[PDB]
Amino acid sequence: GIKILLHPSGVVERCMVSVVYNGSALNGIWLKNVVYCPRHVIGKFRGDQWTHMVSIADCRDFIVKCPIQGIQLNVQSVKMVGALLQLTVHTNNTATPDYKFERLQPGSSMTIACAYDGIVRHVYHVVLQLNNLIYASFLNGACGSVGYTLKGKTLYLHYMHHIEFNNKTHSGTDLEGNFYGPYVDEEVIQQQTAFQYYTDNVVAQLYAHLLTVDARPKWLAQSQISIEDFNSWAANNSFANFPCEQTNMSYIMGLSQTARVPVERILNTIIQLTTNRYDFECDWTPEMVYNQ
Amino acid sequence: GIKILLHPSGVVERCMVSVVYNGSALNGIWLKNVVYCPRHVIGKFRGDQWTHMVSIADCRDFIVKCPIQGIQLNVQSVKMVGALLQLTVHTNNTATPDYKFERLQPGSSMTIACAYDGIVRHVYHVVLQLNNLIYASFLNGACGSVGYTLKGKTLYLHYMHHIEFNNKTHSGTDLEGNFYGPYVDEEVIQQQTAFQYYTDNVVAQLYAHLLTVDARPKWLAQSQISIEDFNSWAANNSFANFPCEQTNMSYIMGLSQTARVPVERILNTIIQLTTNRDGACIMGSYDFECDWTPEMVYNQ
Ligand SMILES: *C(=O)[C@H](C[C@@H]1CCNC1=O)NC(=O)[C@H](CC(C)C)NC(=O)[C@@H](NC(=O)C(F)(F)F)C(C)(C)C
Ligand SMILES: *C(=O)[C@H](C[C@@H]1CCNC1=O)NC(=O)[C@H](CC(C)C)NC(=O)[C@@H](NC(=O)C(F)(F)F)C(C)(C)C
């Protein structure tokens, strides 16, 4: 069948640590001799206050533990890189894998390893939406949880949790310390970009339905529409211009011959399905549906 | 938010191993000094041929390796328990956690750690259906992959994969060697019982939609139907008798309160949706999903 595929959290679990600073506690990941955690554990500051507030944070206050290895690390250097803190410790993590800090483009998926007190409690699947927010699930003390993927032996880190917004949305930074979207780690109302459907993922979801549930459903459109006529419709109906990624076409084309339904009909079905309308319609990437 | 939550797989990766027997390769789990793996690694036998074929199987032909620990295991004795092989090794797994073999009932969820060659490649979420099948995703060499849950420190093993049927459905045994349902590890057509929706889980899906997507969607029924009037309809529309588990009512009654929508409207919505859905996408699904359990939607 066709399922939402997640990446095994084992390599991330061995690197997770807990970071507690003067009553505030969150999570952090431990790679080589550096621990990466959100900067707001030292306090809730704004704008350019961070440089100076990090400069006076004494390392003896950074209590860092890695429960899965039963060792308490000692901080020696503290450096702010973006909106993250790089905590240099004496002990090198023997469980460090070959990794890479890869930034996500909107529409791509990743595995969140939701962690509390330095221990991963849940893992689940999210996709970065065009508003640069993820629709996830976090409670107090979850900041520092990472979103990742895996390509063979290499851990690809994409995300670290920072803040939750009113409409059940979440934003954080990449492991280089830069937020996704115009969002910051400040507890104020922040304007969001209007939502837009990642069209390639909507098309991938419908094809997954025809390949597993029903080869010919009733709501499927009988007539085609051109990509051009769809893209003119999409510019006024909050749908992204198709195709979002030119590299998704070889997947979608292969999916359409497997399903014996040209993408023109799927696009038309998307337009006809606007009668029936957060939404969760873009969790299925064309790669994940085609490869499996 | 309300998400499909999987259990962290690191405990299972440290215990996974690969078992190869005369060109046949599949996975296995290694707890204490015994390896568990499906019995058809020694051949594709039928009926009661297993006990004789296992008793003549040379332990020197079992090539067992644990790639995450760099250990190659040596098999002392082999005994068949149910449809599973228990391969005694000379080395105790140091990473063995406190575990328990717990058989699932239909309607309950578990995390599948899909492995190949002793290494888990994908983890995903499935729910045991009333036909005692799971709707999963497996290729050749994936047998031996386990489904599991975690309650704090104890690892709860529920399932080990053995066979895939034509309609993209999968079956296997619990870790005690007994299949779920009347299915066996033989490559012939086996009658499956008709599909039936786990009503408690479909109720939990619509409640999940009301709590994170849209509180008052256009397809939510305005009128109610009683549980009994629903169960009369359920017997003719492939829906289980509500409730499937009495223990789900404490969760469902909780979801009713915070959503300000009683379960009677959810049940009447289920009935209306079977005739006037026309492509509505509930919780990211164009289908009735049994993947959302009331406990998972209510707890998180
Ligand atoms: C870090 O672990 C916590 C966790 C939050 C709370 C539950 N969901 C989460 O992800 N993050 C914060 O408390 C964060 C601190 C800032 C200094 C970064 N603040 C928030 O997420 C707040 N949100 C806002 O005030 C908002 F931005 F206006 F939305 C709440 C109110 C604590 C959620
Ligand atoms: C063990 O690793 C595999 C897992 C399979 C491979 C394809 N998808 C899976 O989940 N088990 C088998 O290949 C199994 C071996 C028997 C001796 C138990 N055979 C099958 O699953 C076959 N299915 C049938 O013949 C069926 F029962 F009629 F459906 C196929 C045809 C190889 C899938």
Coordinates of all heavy atoms in Angstrom, one line a residue, chain B residues 25-26 40 43-44 138-144 161-166 170 185-190, ligand 2, unseen atoms left out:
Chain B
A25 N 16.3 -14.4 2.9 CA 16.7 -13.4 3.8 C 15.5 -12.6 4.3 O 14.7 -12.2 3.5 CB 17.7 -12.4 3.2
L26 N 15.5 -12.5 5.6 CA 14.4 -11.6 6.3 C 15.0 -11.1 7.6 O 16.2 -11.3 7.9 CB 13.1 -12.4 6.5 CG 13.2 -13.9 6.9 CD1 13.6 -14.0 8.3 CD2 11.8 -14.5 6.8
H40 N 9.1 -19.2 7.8 CA 9.3 -19.5 6.3 C 10.7 -19.0 5.8 O 10.9 -19.1 4.6 CB 8.2 -18.8 5.5 CG 8.3 -17.3 5.3 ND1 7.6 -16.4 6.1 CD2 9.0 -16.6 4.5 CE1 7.9 -15.2 5.7 NE2 8.8 -15.3 4.7
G43 N 12.1 -22.1 4.2 CA 11.4 -22.7 3.0 C 10.0 -22.3 3.0 O 9.5 -21.6 3.9
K44 N 9.3 -22.7 2.0 CA 7.9 -22.3 1.8 C 7.1 -23.6 1.9 O 6.7 -24.2 0.9 CB 7.7 -21.7 0.4 CG 8.4 -20.3 0.3 CD 8.0 -19.6 -1.0 CE 8.7 -18.3 -1.2 NZ 8.2 -17.6 -2.4
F138 N 5.1 -3.1 2.6 CA 6.2 -4.0 2.8 C 6.7 -4.5 1.4 O 5.9 -4.7 0.5 CB 5.9 -5.2 3.7 CG 5.7 -4.9 5.1 CD1 4.5 -5.0 5.7 CD2 6.8 -4.5 5.9 CE1 4.3 -4.7 7.1 CE2 6.6 -4.2 7.2 CZ 5.4 -4.3 7.8
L139 N 8.0 -4.7 1.3 CA 8.6 -5.4 0.1 C 9.3 -6.7 0.5 O 9.2 -7.1 1.7 CB 9.5 -4.4 -0.6 CG 8.9 -3.1 -1.1 CD1 10.0 -2.2 -1.5 CD2 8.1 -3.4 -2.4
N140 N 9.9 -7.3 -0.4 CA 10.7 -8.5 -0.1 C 11.8 -8.2 0.9 O 12.4 -7.2 0.8 CB 11.3 -9.1 -1.4 CG 10.2 -9.5 -2.4 OD1 9.8 -8.6 -3.2 ND2 9.7 -10.7 -2.4
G141 N 12.0 -9.2 1.8 CA 13.0 -9.0 2.8 C 12.6 -8.2 4.0 O 13.4 -7.9 4.8
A142 N 11.3 -7.8 4.1 CA 10.8 -7.0 5.2 C 10.2 -7.9 6.3 O 10.0 -7.4 7.4 CB 9.8 -6.0 4.7
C143 N 9.9 -9.2 6.0 CA 9.4 -10.1 7.0 C 10.3 -10.1 8.2 O 11.5 -10.0 8.1 CB 9.2 -11.5 6.5 SG 7.9 -11.6 5.3
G144 N 9.8 -10.2 9.4 CA 10.5 -10.0 10.6 C 10.3 -8.6 11.2 O 10.6 -8.5 12.4
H161 N 5.8 -9.3 10.8 CA 5.2 -9.4 9.5 C 5.6 -10.7 8.8 O 6.8 -11.1 8.9 CB 5.7 -8.2 8.7 CG 5.1 -8.2 7.3 ND1 3.8 -8.2 7.0 CD2 5.7 -8.4 6.1 CE1 3.6 -8.3 5.7 NE2 4.7 -8.4 5.1
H162 N 4.7 -11.3 8.1 CA 4.9 -12.5 7.4 C 4.5 -12.6 5.9 O 5.1 -13.2 5.2 CB 4.1 -13.6 8.0 CG 4.5 -14.2 9.3 ND1 5.0 -15.4 9.5 CD2 4.6 -13.6 10.6 CE1 5.3 -15.6 10.7 NE2 5.1 -14.6 11.4
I163 N 3.4 -11.9 5.5 CA 2.8 -12.2 4.2 C 2.0 -11.0 3.7 O 1.5 -10.2 4.5 CB 1.9 -13.5 4.2 CG1 1.6 -13.9 2.8 CG2 0.6 -13.2 5.0 CD1 1.0 -15.3 2.7
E164 N 1.9 -10.8 2.4 CA 1.2 -9.7 1.8 C 0.2 -10.3 0.8 O 0.6 -11.2 0.0 CB 2.2 -8.8 1.1 CG 1.5 -7.8 0.1 CD 2.5 -7.0 -0.7 OE1 3.1 -6.1 0.0 OE2 2.6 -7.2 -1.9
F165 N -1.0 -9.9 0.9 CA -2.1 -10.4 0.0 C -2.3 -9.4 -1.2 O -1.8 -8.3 -1.2 CB -3.4 -10.5 0.8 CG -3.3 -11.6 1.9 CD1 -3.4 -11.3 3.2 CD2 -3.1 -13.0 1.5 CE1 -3.3 -12.3 4.2 CE2 -3.1 -13.9 2.5 CZ -3.2 -13.6 3.8
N166 N -3.1 -9.9 -2.1 CA -3.2 -9.2 -3.4 C -3.8 -7.7 -3.2 O -3.4 -6.8 -3.9 CB -4.1 -10.0 -4.3
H170 N -1.7 -6.9 4.7 CA -0.6 -7.6 5.3 C -1.1 -8.4 6.5 O -1.9 -7.9 7.3 CB 0.5 -6.7 5.6 CG 1.0 -6.0 4.4 ND1 0.6 -4.7 4.0 CD2 1.9 -6.3 3.4 CE1 1.2 -4.3 2.9 NE2 2.0 -5.3 2.5
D185 N 1.0 -18.7 6.7 CA 2.1 -18.3 5.9 C 2.3 -19.3 4.7 O 3.2 -20.1 4.6 CB 3.4 -18.3 6.7 CG 3.6 -19.5 7.5 OD1 2.6 -20.2 7.8 OD2 4.7 -19.8 7.9
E186 N 1.3 -19.2 3.8 CA 1.3 -20.0 2.6 C 0.9 -19.2 1.4 O 0.1 -18.3 1.5 CB 0.3 -21.2 2.8 CG 0.8 -22.3 3.8 CD -0.2 -23.3 4.1 OE1 -1.3 -23.3 3.4 OE2 0.0 -24.2 4.9
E187 N 1.6 -19.4 0.3 CA 1.3 -18.6 -1.0 C 0.2 -19.2 -1.8 O 0.3 -19.7 -2.9 CB 2.6 -18.6 -1.8 CG 3.9 -18.2 -1.0 CD 4.9 -17.6 -1.9 OE1 5.4 -18.2 -2.8 OE2 5.3 -16.4 -1.6
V188 N -1.0 -19.2 -1.2 CA -2.3 -19.5 -1.9 C -3.4 -18.6 -1.5 O -3.2 -17.9 -0.5 CB -2.7 -21.0 -1.6 CG1 -1.9 -22.0 -2.4 CG2 -2.6 -21.3 -0.1
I189 N -4.4 -18.6 -2.2 CA -5.5 -17.6 -2.0 C -6.3 -18.0 -0.8 O -6.8 -19.1 -0.7 CB -6.5 -17.5 -3.2 CG1 -6.7 -18.9 -3.8 CG2 -5.9 -16.6 -4.3 CD1 -7.5 -19.0 -5.1
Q190 N -6.4 -17.1 0.2 CA -7.1 -17.4 1.5 C -8.2 -16.4 1.7 O -8.1 -15.2 1.5 CB -6.1 -17.2 2.7 CG -4.7 -17.9 2.4 CD -3.8 -17.6 3.6 OE1 -4.2 -17.3 4.7 NE2 -2.5 -17.8 3.3
Ligands
LIG2 C1 8.9 -11.8 3.9 O1 10.0 -10.9 3.9 C2 8.0 -11.5 2.7 C3 7.2 -10.2 2.8 C4 6.4 -9.8 1.6 C5 7.1 -9.6 0.3 C6 6.2 -8.8 -0.6 N1 5.5 -8.0 0.5 C7 5.6 -8.5 1.7 O2 5.1 -8.1 2.7 N2 7.0 -12.6 2.6 C8 6.7 -13.2 1.5 O3 7.1 -12.9 0.4 C9 5.7 -14.4 1.6 C10 6.3 -15.7 1.9 C11 5.4 -16.9 2.3 C12 6.1 -18.2 2.3 C13 4.7 -16.6 3.6 N3 4.9 -14.5 0.4 C14 4.0 -13.5 0.1 O4 3.8 -12.5 0.8 C15 3.3 -13.6 -1.3 N4 1.9 -13.6 -1.2 C16 1.1 -14.6 -1.6 O5 1.5 -15.5 -2.3 C17 -0.4 -14.5 -1.2 F1 -0.6 -15.0 0.0 F2 -1.1 -15.2 -2.1 F3 -0.8 -13.2 -1.2 C18 3.8 -12.6 -2.4 C19 3.1 -13.0 -3.7 C20 5.3 -12.7 -2.6 C21 3.5 -11.2 -2.0

